[PDB]
Amino acid sequence: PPAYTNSFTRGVYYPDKVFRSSVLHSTQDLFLPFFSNVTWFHAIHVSGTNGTKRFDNPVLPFNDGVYFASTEKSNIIRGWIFGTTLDSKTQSLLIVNNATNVVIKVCEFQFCNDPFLGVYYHKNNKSWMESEFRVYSSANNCTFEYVSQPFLMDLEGKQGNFKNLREFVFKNIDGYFKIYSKHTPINLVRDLPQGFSALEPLVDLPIGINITRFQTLLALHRSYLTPGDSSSGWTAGAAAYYVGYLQPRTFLLKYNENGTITDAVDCALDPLSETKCTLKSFTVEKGIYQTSN
């Protein structure tokens, strides 16, 4: 059965590009509720001795807003497909992450019954068939191009396990697709770091197309040599990944002189936060106040 767990405060983003400082701002938009219950999936390598569990690329709801987060050293998830008929007639979004560079293309291509990608790690020569892109049959029309630049540059030393944490937020409002992404430095293996962060808006596409389904793209290993997928201790990998759902709740955000939002409070989560939102101040004074009916 589904395993419910508490949803951390992660998943906040700036409603727009407006700049504010030392002023609390309320915003009523599709956001991720704080401390909400989220269902966590499971990953196994050996199966075939149970009932109705361990499905392949299950279809998830296409709600207007959905949260996404995961920590994959090898970047197992490498693409997203949008559409309803899945017959390539309509435009479908495509994202490719190669050498830490993200490329976005709207090319139309046919979708296989069980799309997958093959990755062969621990090879003498690297970069082999890297540009083959054996993820789709063939493209039909390509009228869009995108380019990517480095976010930051550091000194000597390479890590694939614990070097950064990736945060992505996806939502659709009036058919206007938006892109959110953040790469934050963290050094901790004992537990997930606790903190508050926000995702800035990169690009907005007012395509206006109506979609109700999506499918992701996963990369697996073609040969069985290791007792697992990429490491030991567990049955199939070892990492943290949570998925949430966005609802039309209203948040109150706190800006600082640095121009970055440092705190967020959910007005409807509890009466305390409701009175905090009503008074437009985190500090709560003595007395009794009327909230609502």
Place this chain on the structure above:
Amino acid sequence: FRVQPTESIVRFPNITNLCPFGEVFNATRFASVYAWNRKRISNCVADYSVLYNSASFSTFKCYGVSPTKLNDLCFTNVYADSFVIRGDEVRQIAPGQTGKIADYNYKLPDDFTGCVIAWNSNNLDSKVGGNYNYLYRLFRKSNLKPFERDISTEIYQAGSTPCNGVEGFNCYFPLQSYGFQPTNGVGYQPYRVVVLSFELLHAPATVCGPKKSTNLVKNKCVNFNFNGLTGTGVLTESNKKFLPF
């Protein structure tokens, strides 16, 4: 008492590089007349404004609008069809003129609006070792509709004897190319012609022509308009750290 701006204070966006026509101009082999590439062009502006000091073309004629009004009219669809024609056929090729070219291979709507740009390619087409890439359909069973292409390569059957896909009695080969004769004179030199087809309808008006930018004044109240949003104030200099995005 109110202080108004002298004339105006307006600022425009950044360089906003134009369409990537460099790759098309520098392309080793231009698209053939029979098969012309069709790629949507957007998020850029026409480069005619920069052609004041450049390699002048043989002719630039815009029937729909005057050459100086191009920047005053917005553009939505940009599709250029480039082909090669003979010099002696330039006079015989023109809108509203009846002829063999107009009847079979050159068919366009009577109300079609666009610009025609012709230039001599002898400076580049010369000494190309008479490549036969260019091809055209001399005859067809019917008149091609606008933006239509023929993919049937079957041998045309004029007589009762079937051609069976091979040459035979009363069998015609429609596909043909322009023979390259090294002894061709000046009048026979091929000329490259481009026709810009666009209706300016069915799509939002996003691309706009260049606009002259005035000077900027500081420490004085003035009107301004950024990204459509209007306002009034004083523009100064501040060293406060700001987010790049």
Place this chain on the structure above:
Amino acid sequence: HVQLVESGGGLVQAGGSLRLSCAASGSIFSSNAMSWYRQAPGKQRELVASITSGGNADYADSVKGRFTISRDKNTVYPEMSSLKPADTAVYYCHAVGQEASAYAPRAYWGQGTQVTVSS
């Protein structure tokens, strides 16, 4: 004459994905339209696909996407997908040749390549 044969073939696994690359080696190429046809018992020749000299390519709905051919820089790239037992057929390639009347004024019809699927 241009020989497009690359190799006899090889073993194919269930749900495989092979992207063969044409040799593109020989004499000087030309901007000639290409046509791809499918043949099988009980059926005559049909216009399955037609690719021009980089302008555009037309494919049938049944063969759309999963079987395709692309032209780029005088090179032919075939994309193969959706392999099923019923796909056993013969491929035919048709080209256009103008400077071929010196000794054989006939179209260069390449020999049909038979493909069969069987575990």
